[PDB]
């Protein structure tokens, strides 16, 4: 090839055509010019961080329903175990447990931090307002015991161990959001339940037609007696204000599950802040498909 | 099959439509062209325009994307087919790699057939001329309309139109390397010399010439009917370019295989990854500069034409631009070629210009037989006549057939001394010989009408100083005084304040054959040379002045500008060449010869070192002893050379000379015998309307108003397009950053992903389909003649400072600007930038739906993936808007854009197109399920202004310590 | 309320100045 004369000469001293006083100040350019570059970046990324609030975000629509997602964080929204088998529904058990660490009532006792809001559904606490005049703001405690027979206060397996399972039910949390359930025309929403005017109703039925037939018994469990969630949490202040902030929870339990076929079920919440969308098939709703093996 | 060459003149009387003289008919001229057709020839079919079309549709580089639309419409299938919710999001991807295609073929086709549409225009612009001799007499016509049965004369040079039938030729010869391929003249005559019309006296053909002599012919054949018309390309600039797209297209190959195996590691679904792999490789290689070549060579073209400046094939535009000799004639280019008459001498007296019209003025008519016979040699030795439909004006206003040199000093001896038809009334007529640039003689012999001298005389006219020495016993006061050394002094002085002032000067003399041995009954030849051509009787000089055209000194002043070396070869004296080179500025103000500067020190000439002169005269005759070593020293140490008494043989040795010392040559020619310096020079130049056909049939140009101004203007023309393609060069490759650095950082820092492959589809589409074309109309800048010529093997189109320039300065700020708006948009959605490290592998974790940002709100996945798609599309606009700046600081390379303005209109158009495409791809209606493009609020669009401004305001800094300081680091560094 | 805005205001001045530069980009490169 073309050796000895485009790598080095020693007659001009001249590495790659260019002499070793001349490698120097093109390497000096390029050093100052990405500096200076590097500079004008971080210097315009900081100068946008303060028109940004610490309290409230600048666009909330977005996020503005919220989504309603169930805590055995599962993997194609499907539960498949065998009750006799203790390793099929090892898994599910576990993330139960270390999603119900915060909410036990022993990390509740801090009396400054947390506050003993009433044991029946009642109206949002409105908290003061997003400009830091009052530090803290404190956090309602929930207590598990609402939660019953899916709580950890008794089958520590949550019944999956005899066969009826039971998931936990959530809503997003949104800054500043206060949820509006449906008012009292007797025609409004579907079909029948009881109704409460502090509870953000929610229900969970069979998605297709076979699967009305096969999913059996529903049991919810809550705060109060009509399944739903609570609204004397709301609109929550976001982690800068309220840390250990605890949003209210749902359990639903199955008690006679149809065994050794897949059942599909869809999980709504109602009300007029809520809605829906088609593409996103977690937005205001949710759907799981169940399959009790024998 | 047989031509009538067998068969005589009664057989040709009985052939054709009865003609033999005086013209055909004019009226038979249309019955002809009706009833066949034009003199016309077709042999090329055509290729369709379908053809043409589906190669660009469906060519290099746009099947990548026909194939990734069939393996999206594929999967579709397969998905609609085997499943339930067929989620028909694969199939406006397919329409998408769809429209991509259809509007970049559309594109090209376009370019590609307005180029094709001048190209094939520049025919019928110097159309042939063939001269017949129809009923009315001699007209000249449009070559393609002779007809069968029409009888043509063509003279040396002329190009034959059809095929003929010699009837009377005067010693043409022919070159019949058209069909025989020997290129040795042969003899063409009426006489017969072989049964068939191919190697015989008679009978010529079409597409050959005659070099010399004069004939008359009949036309047999016309048309696709003869025996020539029955049985019968990469520009070195086109070859660079696509040689370096051969070395982008193997780097984005591999950058889009290492991409493509990197996307399947973080889990793409495949078709995701193969699509990103065509996206890239796609992107990556800049195929739509290969048109914009062929946009800038041919469009040039169109410039030149426009300036009186006509090439003949496209490779001739992009060595025009490169010239450093320009090697020209005088008498015709440099000069106006309308000799009028003045400064007589004759009886050791330098006479008045005789130019007024009022009769016996200042001085002139001193009637001593002197006078009178000299115009008698200045009226007898011409064969220029007035033309006909002339006696309606007297002198200043009338046309005359033949030379200008000839018709000066006719133009002289009508005004005085009675007519020149009273001179053909008075002399007879026996002999002539025609002057020829290789004898500088004109003799004649005559009969004198009278008895009072008997002897019968001759007359004769050349170059002085070859006259004089034949002609040598000077008749002073009608006597026959012989020579002495202060006669030659007179001589040499008269002839030193004549051409002093930038005359033409001509010689005059005649001899009395007297009849003590012919009587005057005998009859004359001459090429038996039995007459005396030495000791004549030598009468005195005319000179005519020949004045400058009125473009050339500024021409002049732009070639020594530009560098450019220019050298005069005429055919004239060594005194009227030096006069006329000092008044148009080739021997400039300030530089000197020998002989100047050895007469100013009034010293011998064999004494002076000749280092300290850099101008030249060269004689013609010390050319001819002058070895191939002893030529190139004086090519070498003079920078203003002239040629003087230069044979048009003798300009092939100048042009390898130069040729030999490193140059590219432009030569200027218009004769028979100048077609070896034509095509031997690199650019040849012919001219247009006192020129040959064999001359424009040699040349790479023609110059269509014979001008020397408009060749610099053409070296001009050829300089622009180098500069128009090192921008357009500069541009398109400024992109390749920013499509490049969001999947590194994405897979380095593990941040969503800022861009996308739709958006990177369209961020090319746009701002590399219409700004890059728009380059090449660029005009020129302030200072293009003020440069060295290139060396066409030493500077390249692309360098190291233009890839360094491209890639490493102005594509890391255009990077950064969309980088910073990426930032923007997810930091006011709810995310902050320190928050977005490490966030990738659970934002694109399809069933984790409630992702905590920094206010702690939970997200659901279609919900974050909305903003990521927002965050493509502002991508898109950013990059967009600090393209911008980019084509705006691309249009100029020293200049500044505010004195170089704003005229070009292609560049608005595609600047106005850029953000109307941005803005419609934003915020129509539908947008959001078939790109996933999402709309912008409106002061996100301002995000990457300040990325603009700072592309501007470096680029306009960096352009003005080029022009402060020059010669500096920067201009080493950073001008590509 | 903070949860809403109209994106329709926004799309129709988008719209009118694409509509707008396109036929402006029309009008200076026809002027020949
Ligand atoms: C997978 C990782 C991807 C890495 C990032 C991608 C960037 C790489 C793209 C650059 C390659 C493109 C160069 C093509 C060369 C064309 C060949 C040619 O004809 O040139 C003739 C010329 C011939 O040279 P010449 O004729 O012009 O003059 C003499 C030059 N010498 C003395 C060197 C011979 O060769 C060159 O172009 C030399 C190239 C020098 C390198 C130029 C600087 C490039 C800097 C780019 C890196 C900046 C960061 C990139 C992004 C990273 C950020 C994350
Ligand atoms: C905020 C942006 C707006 C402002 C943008 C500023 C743009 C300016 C960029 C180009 C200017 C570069 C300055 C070079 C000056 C040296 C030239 C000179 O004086 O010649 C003689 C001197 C002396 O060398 P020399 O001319 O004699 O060359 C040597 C040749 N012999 C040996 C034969 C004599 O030139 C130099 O040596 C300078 C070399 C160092 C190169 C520059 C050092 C780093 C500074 C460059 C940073 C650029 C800032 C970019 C930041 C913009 C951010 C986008
Ligand atoms: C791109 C070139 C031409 C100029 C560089 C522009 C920025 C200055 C680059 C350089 C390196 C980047 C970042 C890479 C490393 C991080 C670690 C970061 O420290 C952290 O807080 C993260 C770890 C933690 O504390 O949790 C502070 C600096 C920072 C943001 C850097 C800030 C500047 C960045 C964006
Ligand atoms: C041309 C290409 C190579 C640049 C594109 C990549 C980005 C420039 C990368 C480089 C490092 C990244 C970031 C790494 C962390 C820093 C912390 C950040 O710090 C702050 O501004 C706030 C810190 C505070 O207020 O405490 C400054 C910029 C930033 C986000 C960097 C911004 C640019 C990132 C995304
Ligand atoms: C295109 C060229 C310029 C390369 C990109 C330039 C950036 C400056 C590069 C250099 C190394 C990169 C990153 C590699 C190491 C990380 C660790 C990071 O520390 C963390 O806290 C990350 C926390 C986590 O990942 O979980 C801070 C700096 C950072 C983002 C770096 C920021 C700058 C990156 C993107
Ligand atoms: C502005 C100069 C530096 C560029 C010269 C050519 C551009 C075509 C100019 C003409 C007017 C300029 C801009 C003036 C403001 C509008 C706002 C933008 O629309 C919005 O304001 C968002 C909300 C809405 O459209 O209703 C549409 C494009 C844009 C940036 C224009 C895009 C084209 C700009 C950059
Ligand atoms: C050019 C360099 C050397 C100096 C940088 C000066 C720039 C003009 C600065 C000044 C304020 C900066 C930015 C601050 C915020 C951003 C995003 C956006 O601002 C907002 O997000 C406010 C929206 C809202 O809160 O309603 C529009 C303006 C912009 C692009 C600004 C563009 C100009 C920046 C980079
Ligand atoms: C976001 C910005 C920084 C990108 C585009 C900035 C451009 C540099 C702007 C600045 C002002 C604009 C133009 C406004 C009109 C004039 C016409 C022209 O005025 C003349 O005198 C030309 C006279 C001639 O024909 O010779 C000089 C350049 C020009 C300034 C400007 C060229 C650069 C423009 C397009
Ligand atoms: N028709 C003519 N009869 C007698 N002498 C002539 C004639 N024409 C030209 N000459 C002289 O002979 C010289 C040689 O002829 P040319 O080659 O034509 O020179 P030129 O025309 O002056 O210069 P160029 O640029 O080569 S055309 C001329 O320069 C005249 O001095
Ligand atoms: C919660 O679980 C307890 C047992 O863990 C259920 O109590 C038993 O329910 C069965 C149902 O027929 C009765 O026969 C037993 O007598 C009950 N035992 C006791 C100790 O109460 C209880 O029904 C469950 N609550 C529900 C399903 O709402
Ligand atoms: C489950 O038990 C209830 C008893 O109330 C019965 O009505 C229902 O049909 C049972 N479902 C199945 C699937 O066996
Ligand atoms: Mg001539
Ligand atoms: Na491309
Ligand atoms: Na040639
Ligand atoms: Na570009
Ligand atoms: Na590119």
Redesign the pocket.
Same mark, same amino acid.
């Given at each position: 090839g073309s050796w000895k004369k485009f790598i080095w000469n020693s007659e001009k001293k001249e590495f790659l055509?260019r002499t070793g006083g001349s490698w120097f100040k093109i390497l000096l350019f390029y050093v100052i010019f990405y500096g200076c570059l590097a500079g004008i970046f971080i210097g315009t990324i900081q100068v946008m961080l303060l028109t940004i609030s610490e309290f409230k975000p600048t666009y909330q629509d977005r996020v503005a329903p919220p989504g309603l997602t169930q805590i055995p964080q599962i993997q194609k929204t499907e539960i498949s175990f065998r009750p006799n088998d203790p390793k099929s529904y090892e898994a599910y058990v576990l993330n139960i447990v270390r999603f119900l660490e915060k909410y036990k009532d022993s990390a509740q006792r801090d009396d400054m931090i947390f506050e003993d809001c009433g044991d029946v559904p009642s109206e949002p606490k409105e908290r003061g307002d997003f400009n830091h005049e009052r530090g803290e703001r404190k956090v309602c405690r929930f207590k598990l015991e609402w939660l019953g027979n899916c709580s950890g206060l008794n089958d520590e397996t949550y019944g999956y161990k005899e066969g009826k399972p039971c998931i936990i039910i959530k809503l997003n949390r949104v800054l500043g959001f206060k949820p509006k359930p449906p008012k009292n025309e007797s025609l409004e929403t579907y079909p029948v339940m009881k109704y409460n005017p502090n509870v953000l109703p929610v229900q969970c039925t069979g998605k297709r037609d076979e699967d009305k037939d096969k999913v059996g018994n529903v049991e919810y469990f809550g705060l109060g007696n009509s399944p739903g969630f609570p609204l004397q949490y709301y609109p929550y202040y976001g982690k800068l204000l309220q840390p250990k902030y605890l949003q209210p929870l749902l359990a639903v339990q199955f008690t006679n599950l149809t065994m050794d076929t897949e059942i599909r079920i869809e999980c709504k919440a109602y009300g007029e802040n809520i809605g829906y969308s088609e593409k996103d098939r977690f937005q205001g709703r949710f759907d799981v498909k169940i399959e009790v093996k024998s | 099959s047989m031509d009538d060459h067998k068969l005589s003149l009664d057989e040709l009387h009985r052939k054709y439509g009865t003609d033999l003289s005086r013209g055909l008919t004019s009226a038979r001229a249309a019955e002809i062209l009706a009833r066949d057709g034009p003199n016309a020839l077709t042999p090329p079919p055509t290729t369709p325009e379908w053809i043409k079309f589906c190669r660009q549709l469906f060519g290099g580089f746009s099947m990548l994307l026909w194939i990734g639309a069939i393996l999206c419409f594929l999967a579709y299938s397969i998905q609609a087919a085997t499943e339930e919710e067929p989620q028909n999001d694969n199939l406006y991807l397919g329409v998408v790699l769809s429209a991509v295609v259809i509007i970049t073929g559309c594109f090209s086709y376009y370019q590609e057939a307005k180029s094709s549409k001048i190209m094939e225009s520049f025919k019928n612009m110097v159309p042939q001329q063939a001269l017949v001799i129809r009923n009315g007499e001699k007209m000249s016509i449009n070559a393609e309309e002779v007809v069968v049965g029409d009888l043509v004369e063509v003279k040396g040079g002329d190009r034959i139109p059809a095929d003929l039938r010699i009837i009377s030729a005067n010693g043409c010869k022919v070159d019949n390397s058209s069909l025989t391929g020997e290129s040795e003249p042969q003899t063409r005559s009426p006489d017969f010399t072989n049964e068939n019309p191919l190697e015989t006296r008679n009978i010529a053909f079409f597409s050959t010439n005659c070099v010399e002599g004069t004939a008359r012919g009949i036309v047999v054949y016309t048309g696709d009917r003869t025996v020539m018309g029955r049985i019968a390309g990469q520009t070195p600039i086109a070859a660079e370019i696509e040689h370096?797209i051969h /070395? /982008?297209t193997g &780097?984005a190959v591999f =950058?889009g295989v +290492?991409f493509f195996i990197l996307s399947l590691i973080l889990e793409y679904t495949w078709l995701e990854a193969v699509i990103f792999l065509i996206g890239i490789i796609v992107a990556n290689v800049p195929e739509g500069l290969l048109a914009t070549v062929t946009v800038c060579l041919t469009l040039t073209a169109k410039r030149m034409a426009r300036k009186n400046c006509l090439v003949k094939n496209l490779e001739a535009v992009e060595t025009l631009g490169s010239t450093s000799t320009i090697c020209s004639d005088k008498t015709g280019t440099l000069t106006q070629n309308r000799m009028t008459v003045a400064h007589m001498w004759f009886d050791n007296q330098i006479h008045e210009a005789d130019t007024t019209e009022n009769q016996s003025g200042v001085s002139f008519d001193k009637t001593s037989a002197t006078w009178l016979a000299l115009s008698r040699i200045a009226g007898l030795c011409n064969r220029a006549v007035f033309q006909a439909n002339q006696e309606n004006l007297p002198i200043l206003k009338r046309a005359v057939a033949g030379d200008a040199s000839e018709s000066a000093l006719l133009k002289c001896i009508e005004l005085c001394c009675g007519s020149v038809k009273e001179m053909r009334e008075r002399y007879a007529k026996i002999v002539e010989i025609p002057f020829n640039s290789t004898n500088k003689y004109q003799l004649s012999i005559h009969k004198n009408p009278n008895t009072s001298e008997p002897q019968h005389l001759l007359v004769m006219k050349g170059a002085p100083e070859r006259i004089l020495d034949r002609c040598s016993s000077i008749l002073l006061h009608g006597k026959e005084q012989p020579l002495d050394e202060e006669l030659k002094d007179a001589f040499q002085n008269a002839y030193l304040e004549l051409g002093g002032l930038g005359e033409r000067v001509l010689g005059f003399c005649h001899l009395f054959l007297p009849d003590e041995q012919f009587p005057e009954g005998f009859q004359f030849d001459t090429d038996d040379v039995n007459f005396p051509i030495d000791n004549l009787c030598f009468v005195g000089l005319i000179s005519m002045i020949d004045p400058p055209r009125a473009a050339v000194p500024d021409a002049v002043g732009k070639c020594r500008s530009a560098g450019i070396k220019v050298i005069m070869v005429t055919g004239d004296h060594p005194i009227t060449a030096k006069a006329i080179a000092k008044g148009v500025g080739i021997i400039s103000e300030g530089n000197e010869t020998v002989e100047d500067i050895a007469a100013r020190l009034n010293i011998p000439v064999s004494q002076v070192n000749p280092r300290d002169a850099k101008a030249c005269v060269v004689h013609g005759s010390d050319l001819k002893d002058m070895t191939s070593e002893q030529l190139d020293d004086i090519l070498k140490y003079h920078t203003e050379i002239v040629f003087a008494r230069t044979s048009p043989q003798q300009k092939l040795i100048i042009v390898e000379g130069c040729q030999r010392q490193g140059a590219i040559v432009a030569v200027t020619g218009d004769g028979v015998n100048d077609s070896p310096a034509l095509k031997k020079a690199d650019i040849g130049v012919a001219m247009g309307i006192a020129g040959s056909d064999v001359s424009k049939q040699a040349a790479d140009m023609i110059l269509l108003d014979d001008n020397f101004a408009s060749i610099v203007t053409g070296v001009e023309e050829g300089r622009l397009i180098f500069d128009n393609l090192k921008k357009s060069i500069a541009y398109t490759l400024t992109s390749n /950053?920013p499509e490049?650095?969001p999947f =590194?950082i994405f897979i380095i820092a593990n941040i969503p992903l800022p861009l996308g492959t739709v958006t990177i589809l369209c961020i090319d589409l746009g701002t590399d389909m219409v700004p890059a074309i728009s380059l090449a109309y660029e005009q020129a800048e302030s200072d293009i003649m003020k440069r060295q010529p290139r060396n066409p093997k030493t500077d390249?189109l &692309?360098?190291?400072r233009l890839? +360094?320039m491209a890639?490493?300065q102005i594509g890391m700020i255009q990077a950064l600007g969309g980088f910073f708006t990426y930032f923007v948009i997810l930091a006011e959605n709810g995310f902050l930038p320190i928050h977005l490290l490490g966030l990738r592998v659970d934002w694109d974790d399809r069933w984790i739906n409630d992702v905590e940002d920094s206010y702690g709100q939970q997200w659901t996945y279609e919900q974050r993936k909305i903003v990521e798609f927002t965050c493509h599309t502002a991508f898109f606009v950013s990059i967009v808007v600090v393209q911008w700046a980019d084509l705006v600081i691309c249009k100029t390379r020293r200049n500044s854009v505010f004195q170089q303005g704003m005229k070009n209109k292609i560049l608005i158009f595609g600047l106005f197109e850029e953000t109307a495409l941005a803005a419609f791809l934003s915020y129509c209606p539908g947008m959001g399920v078939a790109l996933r493009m999402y709309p912008l609020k409106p002061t996100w669009w301002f995000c990457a202004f300040p990325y603009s401004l700072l592309i501007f305001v470096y680029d306009e800094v960096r352009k003005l310590i080029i022009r402060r300081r020059p010669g500096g680091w920067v201009e080493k560094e950073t001008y590509y | 309320d903070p949860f809403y805005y109209d994106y329709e205001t926004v799309r129709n001045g988008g719209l009118i100045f694409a509509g707008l530069a396109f036929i402006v980009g029309l009008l200076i490169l026809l002027s020949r």
């Open positions: 055509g | 370096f /070395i /982008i &780097v =950058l +290492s /950053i490049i650095t =590194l390249k &692309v360098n190291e890839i +360094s890639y490493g | -």
